[PDB]
Each structure stands twice: as structure tokens, then as C-alpha cells.
Amino acid sequence: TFEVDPMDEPTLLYVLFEVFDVVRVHRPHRGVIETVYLRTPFSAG
């Protein structure tokens, strides 16, 4: 439930969290980079 003060204009309620998104830059080779990309709670697959 979200209750606020009256708004004059159609203003956005910018709702966030403290959600984690961590990336490891993997590299087994000199020349190419593996991008281990994952938003942790919001499944990328």
C-alpha cells in the first residue's frame, strides 16, 4: 500500500530496491573476454 501527499502533476513514483547485479570479467586468453552478466534476483534466463 502506497499513500502520499496530493500531486499537482502526473509525476512518476520511482520505485527501487537494493537489488544486486554483479559481473565478473572472465579471461582465460590474451585477446578475448568472457562477460559473465547476471542481475541476481531477476533471472536473465
Binding site: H26, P28, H29, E34, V36
Partner: peptide
């Protein structure tokens, strides 16, 4: 070669 599980698996070409 990649990040997780490196293993040899070959077929004849």
C-alpha cells in the same frame, strides 16, 4: 577453455 567446465570431446572430421 571457457569459465566453468573445460573438457575434451572430439568427433572425426
Amino acid at each position: 577453455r571457457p569459465s566453468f567446465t573445460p573438457r575434451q570431446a572430439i568427433l572425426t572430421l
